[PDB]
């Protein structure tokens, strides 16, 4: 369930929710700025049109080239039900709220006006302690809601009743992701689990859009403070200040650049040795997931990337891609000079170790043998292929294997075929 982008969530929306979600304060601005470079023009054009137009016009207004992108963007906006063909008339609520959004249409005593660096530092701090709890740290910040949240997010599982929760296959993969992507998956799971737990996604999600620029919102907002995404000096203040992370929100690494705008620290040697100029134990814990740590200094740690530690990581669920990415995104300024930044021998070795771990591909299936004829065999094979139930075939050897579920269908068909007698 690697929901790497907003588009997957956008498809997970029905008209009965889209219409309410299409509020005037933030959704229109957030949605419009997220639409493709093409559709944004047409939506803005028809913002003053009360009468639909034929698809041929939109089609002829684009060259033969880029027509696929226009079709794809048309598929999205039609999938978003932003307009109706009625033959592309915008939805009245969407048009009206977009119109009001252009101009708009609340105040009180001054706040503590805490410095933006301070806000982003404790936000990063808050996310770090969340990850410190996520990793196998002997001590970390905890909270019943935080724990169950990470658990319902599929990141952690409790092996025994009363024992501390441990990390799942997805959790290990998640831990290595970059902060924005890592935060994104968390936000997405919170949103999904919110509607699941009865929190109105409409209001909280619209609120997330507003932060990027009721009791349900207050409860939700309290969690956002606990996530460090918003600052509130005291629980009594009716006003809050969104942190950089909350402002970024669903902008992704494309907005204001990736998290790579940070000091690099991992050095990778051709002898699989790692030197990470770091004091933050979270980085150490992550490095320990796939490398054998040797020595720790006040500002640096020495480790080695072995078959044991890597194949252990792969066995736990990690991939060489995530490892190579984790290193590359953290590579120290000194090794940035060489190209590629990581030594090819290292990258190739890591990939080759994971590829060894899956030398054998295991697949459940049911095998039929001793087909009395090539005709009925190929006939049954064609049916298995028509059903997409086929797993593997060797017509020369007159054999095929099918998925156990699909097998019941060929079992039924085989019996039907045999019962024709």
């Amino acid at each position: 369930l690697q929901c790497r982008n907003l588009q997957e969530f956008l498809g997970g929306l029905s008209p009965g929710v889209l219409d309410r979600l299409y509020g005037h304060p933030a959704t229109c601005l957030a949605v419009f700025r997220e639409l493709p470079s093409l559709a944004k023009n047409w939506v803005m054009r028809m913002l003053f049109l009360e009468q639909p137009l034929p698809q041929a016009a939109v089609a002829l207004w684009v060259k033969k080239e880029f027509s696929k992108a226009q079709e794809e963007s048309t598929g999205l906006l039609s999938g978003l039900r932003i307009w109706h063909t009625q033959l592309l008339i915008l939805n009245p609520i969407f048009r009206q709220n977009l119109r009001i959004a252009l101009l708009g249409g609340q105040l009180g005593p001054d706040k503590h006006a805490r410095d933006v660096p301070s806000l982003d530092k404790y936000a990063e701090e808050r996310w770090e302690v969340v990850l410190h709890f996520m990793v196998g740290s002997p001590s970390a910040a905890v909270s019943q809601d935080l724990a169950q949240l990470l658990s319902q997010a599929g990141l952690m599982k409790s092996t025994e009743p009363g024992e501390p929760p441990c990390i799942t296959s997805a959790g290990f993969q998640f831990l290595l992701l970059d902060t924005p992507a890592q935060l994104w998956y968390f936000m997405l799971q919170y949103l999904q689990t919110a509607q699941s737990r009865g929190m109105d996604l409409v209001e909280i999600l619209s609120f997330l859009f507003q932060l990027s620029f009721s009791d349900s919102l207050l409860n939700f907002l309290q969690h956002l403070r606990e996530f460090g995404l918003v600052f509130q000096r005291k629980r009594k203040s009716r006003r809050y200040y969104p942190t950089r992370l909350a402002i970024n929100l669903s902008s992704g690494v494309s907005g204001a650049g990736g998290t790579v705008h940070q000091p690099g620290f991992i050095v990778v040697e051709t002898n699989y040795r790692l030197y990470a100029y770091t004091e933050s134990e979270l980085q150490i814990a992550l490095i320990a997931l796939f490398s054998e740590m040797l020595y720790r200094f006040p500002n640096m740690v020495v480790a080695q990337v072995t078959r044991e530690s890597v194949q252990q990581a792969i066995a736990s669920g990690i991939t060489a891609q995530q490892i190579i990415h984790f290193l590359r995104t953290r590579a120290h300024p000194v090794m940035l000079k060489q190209t590629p930044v990581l030594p090819p021998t290292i990258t190739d070795q890591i990939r080759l170790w994971e590829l060894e771990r899956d030398r054998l591909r295991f697949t459940e299936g049911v095998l039929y043998n001793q087909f009395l004829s090539q005709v009925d065999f190929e006939l049954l094979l064609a049916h298995a292929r028509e059903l997409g139930v086929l797993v593997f075939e060797n017509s020369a050897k007159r054999l095929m294997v099918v998925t156990p579920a699909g097998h019941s269908d060929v079992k039924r068909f085989w019996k039907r075929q045999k019962h024709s007698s």
């Binding site: 060489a320 891609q321 090819p344 990258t347 190739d348 990939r351 080759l352 590829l355």
Partner: peptide, 15 residues
Amino acid sequence: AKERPIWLRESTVQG
């Protein structure tokens, strides 16, 4: 002339 072969130019591992 005498350029490196392909197997020494790029990663031969499927990745």
